Amino acid sequence: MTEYKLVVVGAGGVGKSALTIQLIQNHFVDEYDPTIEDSYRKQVVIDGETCLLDILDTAGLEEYSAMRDQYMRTGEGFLCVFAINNSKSFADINLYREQIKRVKDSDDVPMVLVGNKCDLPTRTVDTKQAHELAKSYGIPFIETSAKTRQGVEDAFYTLVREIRQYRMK
C-alpha cells in the first residue's frame, strides 16, 4: 500500500487543522487551538488504489517562519491553504510556495491551492483571483469548508493524485 507524505501549510488561523481533523475525525469545533506540530495517518481509496496518507499539520504562527526547511525537505506534497475572508493569508501563499520551491530546489513540487472557509459570506478573495494564481503555478485550486466538509476529501485526494502523477512521470 503506497504511502504519501502530505504537509498542510499556510498562514495562522486559515483552517489547516480544522481541515485535517475533518478528514481524520469527521468533526469540526470552532475553538482556536493554534498548532505546534501534529501528525496523522489515514487509509483511503483513491481511484481504486489503497493509499496511506501521512499528514503533517504545521504551525502557521509567523514567529517560527525560520523552522520550516526540514519538514519541507521531508514532505512529498503540500496543501497550501488560505482563507477566502483573509486577503493577507492569500498573499502569504506565494511566500510559502517560494520557500518550498527554494528548499526542495525544484519548480515541480506537488501542491494544491486550497481556499478554505467558503461557508462564510464575508469573502474578500474572489474565486477568479485564486484560480489565476493556481493557473500560474500549474497546480489545482479547490475551495473548501472544514465546517461543512465541502471539498475536504477532494482537496487531500487531489494532492495525492498530484504526487502520483509526479512519481509515474
Binding site: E31, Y32, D33, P34, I36, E37, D38, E63
Partner: protein, 164 residues
Amino acid sequence: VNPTVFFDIAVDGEPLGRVSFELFADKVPKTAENFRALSTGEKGFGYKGSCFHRIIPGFMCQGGDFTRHNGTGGKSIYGEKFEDENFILKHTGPGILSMANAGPNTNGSQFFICTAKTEWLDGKHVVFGKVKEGMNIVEAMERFGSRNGKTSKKITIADCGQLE
C-alpha cells in the same frame, strides 16, 4: 511586598510536590493580581483542579485552562481577556512565570513556566513572576512532556493558594 502563591502538583492523582512563585506586583500589578486571585480561587473560579496541558522538555510547562480543560480556554478576573500590562521583564532563564496568549492583548488565565531562557518571547508575553521554591518539581514535570507538548500522564494543580 510581592505576594507568594503555591501550586501542589499531582501526577495521575498522586502527589509530586509544591512549587511556589513570587509575583512581581511591584512591576506588573494587574497581571500579578489576576494570577494571585485565580490561585486563591476567591472569585469562585481559578487554577485548582486544572492541568498542565503542554509540557515541552527544554522549553516550558504551560497550564491554566480551567474553563474548557483542553488548552484553549481560561479567563481573567477582569473579563475573558485583558491587555498586555507592560513588557518590562524578560524571559531570562528557568523559572520565569509568564502569560500565554493568542496575540496582542489577549491575556486570560493560561500561563507558562520556563525551563530555559526563551528570549524570543520577550515583548510578546508578559513576564510577571518567578519560581521561588520547588524548581526541582518543575524539572520533574518535564519527563511527562514531549516534542509537541502532549503529556503522557495527567499533571494537575491538585491544590493552590496564597502563602503569608
